[PDB]
């Protein structure tokens, strides 16, 4: 589900995005007094914020809409489907929907089939740019990895939305790390404040790096509860690759 109880730290950005996404949801009457239309979407460029998808699944979970991705990372690639019209038919039947690519986030064949997917979403943006079947059809890009150059280059911020997202709120390092500590078995004498604030410079992926790279020492010592010293070692275990 990944509701608001599993994502936090972007209060200003959800306060700014409720007018981009939540506008056709609960207050569509401002079309006369304001004169707004359906934009292309929104994207967040920079380091991985450990929850780049939990936000889309969160707003989509509160909008009470379906989540249909394009690349089909989890058994949703051929379930719907020239494999280009079935997505628009399911988008016509299911008017509330949020599209977010996660799997896309050799240069000869990988850019060949990946160039076929890019041409697919380009002609889909041409069909949706020319005509429109129903509302509440918006696409969201993902620029968090290094191999993402087409989405960052083709979206400079001229006819789309752009958000500077290197330093989200420092809660992408602190409070979503606390949330990632709520799921796993957490003790009561831990202080995530210092170990969460003392990881500067490297990247924003310190949450997933310290959790996943700390699971090898919680798997080595076989401790029933995760201690702060495990995360302290995980800081070095993720700073060695820098």
């Amino acid at each position: 589900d990944s509701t608001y109880e599993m994502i936090g730290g972007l209060d200003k950005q959800i306060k700014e995005i409720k007018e981009v996404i939540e506008l056709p949801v609960k207050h569509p009457e401002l079309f006369e007094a304001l004169g707004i239309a359906q934009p292309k979407g929104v994207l967040l460029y920079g380091p991985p914020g450990t929850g780049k998808t939990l936000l889309a699944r969160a707003v989509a979970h509160h909008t009470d809409c379906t989540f249909i991705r394009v690349s089909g990372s989890e058994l949703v690639q051929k379930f719907i489907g020239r494999m280009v019209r079935e997505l628009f038919v399911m988008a016509r039947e299911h008017a509330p929907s949020i599209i977010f690519m996660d799997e896309i986030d050799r240069l000869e064949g990988g850019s060949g089939g990946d160039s076929e997917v890019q041409r697919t979403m380009l002609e889909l943006l041409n069909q949706l740019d020319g005509f429109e079947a129903t509302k509440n059809i918006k696409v969201i890009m993902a620029t968090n990895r290094i191999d993402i150059l087409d989405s960052a280059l083709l979206r400079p911020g001229r006819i789309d939305r752009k958000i500077e997202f290197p330093p989200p709120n420092e809660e992408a390092r602190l409070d979503i790390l606390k949330i990632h500590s709520r799921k796993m078995n957490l003790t009561r004498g831990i202080n995530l404040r210092k170990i969460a604030e003392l990881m500067p410079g490297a990247s924003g992926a310190e949450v997933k790096g310290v959790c996943t790279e700390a699971g090898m020492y919680a798997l080595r010592e076989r401790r029933v509860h995760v201690t702060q010293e495990d995360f302290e070692m995980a800081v070095a275990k993720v700073m060695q690759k820098d």
């Binding site: 007018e19 401002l30 006369e32 007094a33 304001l34 004169g35 707004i36 020319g130 400079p156 911020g157």
Partner: protein, 233 residues
């Protein structure tokens, strides 16, 4: 400030298929069309000028010429398909927008040059060309398309943006301190989507305090984002 211009070109484009007593009996027959262009471009200015013909008619929209470079050099065959479907769909209006090895581009450009003129075709449909800048394209495309008259985009004459602002604000709620002369005079080379964009973000910014009425200080405060954004790059 372009009502006489839009009615002059409107009469220049509505004489075929309508009002025939001064079209074929007297012998006008301009079977070539016109060519348009806008310095701001964006397709919304030329779309707002040619949209007067889209009220009661059949329209065709082909934007950009990327479909030639993105694939192998198939040639003008797609233009021939548009020509045969324009012949089978004579009661329509042809409009092309965003008109932007080397030996093939020249031969398909000369073939498109002779095809656009229509040496073996009389007046059956009207063709209107559009691009970002007329200076970038080769001047050879003038004689086939533009043989009647051409028009350039005027200046902020304080009447066009005032009329468009009146249409967009025919039902909006604005305070008394919201003057118009500073707005229509301060702006320069802005399309309808720019004033509609600053009005949209102005009402959306005034909605942050449940204020159904937009003030002038919030309108200029919202305009600071567009004026600052256009000067950043």
């Amino acid at each position: 400030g372009l009502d006489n211009q839009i009615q002059e070109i409107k009469e220049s484009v509505e004489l075929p298929l309508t009002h025939p007593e001064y079209y074929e009996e007297m012998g006008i027959k301009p079977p070539k069309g016109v060519i348009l262009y806008g310095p701001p471009g964006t397709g919304k200015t030329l779309l707002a000028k040619a949209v007067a013909n889209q009220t009661s008619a059949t329209f065709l929209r082909v934007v950009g010429s990327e479909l030639i470079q993105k694939y192998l050099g198939d040639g003008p065959k797609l233009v021939r398909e548009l020509f045969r479907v324009a012949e089978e769909h004579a009661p329509s209006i042809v409009f092309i927008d965003e008109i932007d090895g080397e030996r093939e581009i020249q031969r398909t450009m000369l073939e498109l040059l002779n095809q656009l003129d229509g040496f073996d075709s009389r007046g059956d449909v009207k063709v209107i060309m559009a691009t970002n800048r007329i200076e970038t394209l080769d001047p050879a495309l003038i004689r086939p398309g533009r043989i009647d008259r051409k028009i350039e985009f005027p200046l902020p004459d304080e009447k066009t943006k005032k009329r468009i602002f009146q249409i967009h604000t025919s039902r909006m709620t604005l305070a008394d301190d919201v003057t118009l002369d500073d707005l229509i005079m301060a702006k320069d080379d802005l399309s309808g989507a720019d004033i509609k964009a600053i009005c949209t973000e102005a009402g959306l910014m005034a909605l942050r305090e449940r204020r159904m009425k937009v003030t002038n200080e919030d309108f200029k405060k919202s305009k600071e984002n567009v004026l600052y954004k256009k000067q950043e790059g």
